Design a protein around this ligand. Structure first.
Ligand SMILES: [Zn+2]
Lengths: 286, 45, 37, 127, 135
RNA sequence: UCGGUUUCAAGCCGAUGGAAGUUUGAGGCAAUAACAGGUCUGUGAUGCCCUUAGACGUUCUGGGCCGCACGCGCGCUACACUGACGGAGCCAGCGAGUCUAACCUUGGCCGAGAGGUCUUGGUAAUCUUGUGAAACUCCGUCGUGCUGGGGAUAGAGCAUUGUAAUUAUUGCUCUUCAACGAGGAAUUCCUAGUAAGCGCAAGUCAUCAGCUUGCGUUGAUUACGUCCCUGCCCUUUGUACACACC
């Protein structure tokens, strides 16, 4: 797994060589020793072999000596620290360390920047490791995807975490002082919050999306003030999203709505008076 | 200004500017450790 | 501790034998415990 | 009052009668016995009480026995109980009877979790 | 058993000891509604007041309510021994009591303010608790 | 044994008979070539730092290991009416148990209970013990109402183990009755005396489980298929990219 600490053991040179193996494994399968010696743009065996010893000791690389075929294998940690080094260069992350959100294809940590403003890190682990090209590649494409979806969600006004950065399969996002529908006990204006959560699914099917899974743990609720009680309805849902043209968009949309109403019925004992928005009205709305 | 430092000048490669807002209130039991006093006037906002 | 190898750990304190599991597995055949099933 | 009796009557009552008026815990704690060391301590205590300037506070006595139940003989005493690191001067009141000394000497500082600022700078540095 | 039918008579919602009691539940679980009295205590009290509990709470006279309130304030004189009581062997007075519905909370505050005025671990942890959790 | 199948060759598969016929089903034993894997309190004028006011040694108190916005996980108890409560029926197996000590304990008295007290059998296929276990059976109360489901949290008392129970060991009595109306993405385990439900015993054990391993009690649904994914292989084949050209 992820041990961010170890990254502050590496120098300019160890990152240089690790980068060289990153350019050399995306060109050839198993990068041999001379490939790393010649591509790294280094001086001698001194710097490169010392660097590789560091990376191999700190589990960023694996030595594959296949019947005279000497080569190397970049582990997930290597990719992690290269994205993280790219972000250290792009002045986006400065410290890491507090795990809230252990997803299947996503790990969520708590990070910080130069200024001290708290943020969140969603790295993507497809298959967690028997590394081929597809695991790393599709994790990279996964976070690309989710960051682009996220950027289009922040751009169009939706209350969705502002995407700051997409370092490969890793994504830096805004920390949101919120609480999920489980941890929430009661609200001062439950009908307004329902109106909000329905108007949102309306505008989402107006954009062309149907976030198939709109449950209780999905919806975060950020509090801005304690005297006046200001709420904000954050929603984490992107790879489970289903476009408005798919054959099955109907019961997905109406499952979202039925879940909104069923939770608002149980936890806050507030049933909706206006009829729930069907798929058809939103099929014309887009 | 090295006088305006709570930690060693190394801010380029180190931790983050930790802020220690000190809310010191005085407990009036006669003779009492700093611990009990640390557990009598604790406020949260 | 295990009265064989200076070990606080592994102790089978049962029946007053007090051998850690590692040494007791070795001395098992000399004690009387044999492999049947 | 401790069992519905005047404070002076109880104060001037032996430990056996205080055992006669006590909950089960105290009666069993004392019927099983007590060590010889507090016999010195309980003298130290009274020594202070007997060298005290009138109408003020008597001399403080530092204690380590957090397991000693408060018995009427020690009421009005200023006692510096050991928490494990520091002493705490607590003056014995009529209300403290039956209780262990350690309850008046917390063993730890509270857990202040409501500080996200110092939590965003207690992170692992990535540099 | 016996299908016996009474035209009216029963009331829907009654009140005893300044507390609300609802009359169609059995008398045990109609008296359980209040604080200070549970299933087992209302059971024993309604075995002491010689009231038939198999007969519901809509079939009870005020003469039985006066006996019930009577046994509420004298549980040691109707032979309900001290094991059965909430607040037995009090330190303040040295007696045994069974506290009622509005008095249990006052006794609770008396207890926690006893531990706070003494300054025990329970008091400090309790107050710092409520304070910091609420804030 | 009979019949399919196979060069009608070693075998496979179905049926029948059989205590038992997937190899009736589980696991230990080698030689082999790979190990900087653990320590021996093994040894040799062997290379290191010093050499000793260092506490790596002792002790003595009292605090810790639980401290709580939360993340993660194994679980225990639950959302009831194939159910809870109250009455009666009453059926196991695997164990274990005391000496120069106090272990497993019948029975008689006291007690609401927890427990106490006076005795006793057994070093045990002989005594506890038929371990009169629970789920379960039957006769009643409740009636779908967070209810009499659930028993969190919290109050006061009473006892036990322990030198010592406060941050509450545990047990017992009364009271408080929180969340939880079959649970999202997802995921674990299982083919017959097996899953599941149910308790008991033994290890930790001075007090305890919700820990573990066995045991017996009650006892289903669904396959007896496939390579769909998961892997594990073993073939065939092209080839190091034999580091081909950009
Ligand atoms: Zn050993």
């Amino acid at each position: 797994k992820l041990d961010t600490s170890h990254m502050r053991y590496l120098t300019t040179d160890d990152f240089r060589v690790l980068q060289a193996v990153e350019q050399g494994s995306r060109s050839h399968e198993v990068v041999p020793t001379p490939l790393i010696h010649q591509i790294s743009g280094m001086r001698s065996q001194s710097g490169t072999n010392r660097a590789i010893s560091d990376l191999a000791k700190l589990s960023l690389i694996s030595k594959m000596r296949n019947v005279k075929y000497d080569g190397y294998r970049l582990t997930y940690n290597g990719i992690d620290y290269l994205a993280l080094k790219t972000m250290l260069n792009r002045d986006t992350v400065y410290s890491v360390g507090n795990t809230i959100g252990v997803g299947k294809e996503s790990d969520i940590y708590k990070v910080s920047d130069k200024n001290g403003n708290p943020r969140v890190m969603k790295i993507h682990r497809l298959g967690r490791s028997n590394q081929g090209a597809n695991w790393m590649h599709l994790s990279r494409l996964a976070a690309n995807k989710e960051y682009q979806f996220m950027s289009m969600l922040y751009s169009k006004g939706f209350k969705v975490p502002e995407p700051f950065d997409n370092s490969r399969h890793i994504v830096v996002m805004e920390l949101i002082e919120g609480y999920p529908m489980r941890r929430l006990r009661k609200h001062k204006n439950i009908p307004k919050l329902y109106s909000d959560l329905m108007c949102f699914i309306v505008d989402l099917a107006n954009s062309g999306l149907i976030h198939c899974d709109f449950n209780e743990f999905n919806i975060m609720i950020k509090d801005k003030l304690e005297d006046e009680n200001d709420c904000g309805f954050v929603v984490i849902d992107f790879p489970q999203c289903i476009s408005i043209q798919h054959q099955d968009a109907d019961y997905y949309f109406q499952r979202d709505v039925d879940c909104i109403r069923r939770f608002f019925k149980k936890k806050l004992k507030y049933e909706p008076k206006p009829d729930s928005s069907m798929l058809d009205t939103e099929g014309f709305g887009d | 200004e090295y006088d305006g430092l709570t930690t060693a000048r190394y801010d380029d490669h180190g931790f983050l500017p930790g802020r220690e807002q000190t809310s010191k209130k005085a407990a009036v039991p006669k003779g009492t450790s700093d611990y009990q006093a640390k557990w009598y006037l604790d406020d949260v906002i | 501790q295990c009265r064989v190898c200076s070990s606080h750990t592994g102790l089978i304190r049962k029946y007053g034998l007090n051998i850690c599991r590692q040494c007791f597995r070795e001395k098992a055949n000399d004690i009387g415990f044999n492999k049947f099933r | 009052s401790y069992r519905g009796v005047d404070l002076e009557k109880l104060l001037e009552m032996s430990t056996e009668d205080f055992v006669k008026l006590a909950p089960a815990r105290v009666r069993r704690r004392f019927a099983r016995g007590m060590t010889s060391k507090p016999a010195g301590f309980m003298k130290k205590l009274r020594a202070a009480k007997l060298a005290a300037p009138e109408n003020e506070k008597p001399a403080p006595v530092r204690t380590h026995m957090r397991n000693m139940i408060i018995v009427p003989e020690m009421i009005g005493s200023v006692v510096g109980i050991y928490n494990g690191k520091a002493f705490n001067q607590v003056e014995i009141r009529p209300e403290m009877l039956g209780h262990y000394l350690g309850e008046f000497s917390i063993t730890y500082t509270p857990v202040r979790h409501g500080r996200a600022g110092a939590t965003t700078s207690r992170f692992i540095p990535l540099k | 058993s016996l299908v016996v039918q009474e035209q009216g008579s029963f009331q829907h919602i009654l009140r005893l000891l300044n507390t609300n009691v609802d009359g169609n539940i059995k008398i045990v679980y109609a008296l359980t509604t209040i604080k200070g009295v549970g299933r087992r205590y209302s059971n024993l009290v309604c075995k002491k007041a010689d009231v038939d509990l198999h007969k519901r709470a809509g079939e009870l006279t005020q003469e039985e309510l006066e006996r019930i309130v009577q046994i509420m304030q004298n549980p040691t004189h109707y032979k309900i021994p001290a094991w059965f009581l909430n607040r037995q062997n009090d330190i303040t007075d040295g007696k045994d009591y069974h506290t009622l519905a509005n008095n249990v909370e006052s006794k609770l505050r008396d207890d926690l303010e006893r531990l706070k005025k003494i300054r025990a671990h329970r008091g400090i942890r309790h107050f710092w608790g409520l304070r910091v959790r609420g804030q």
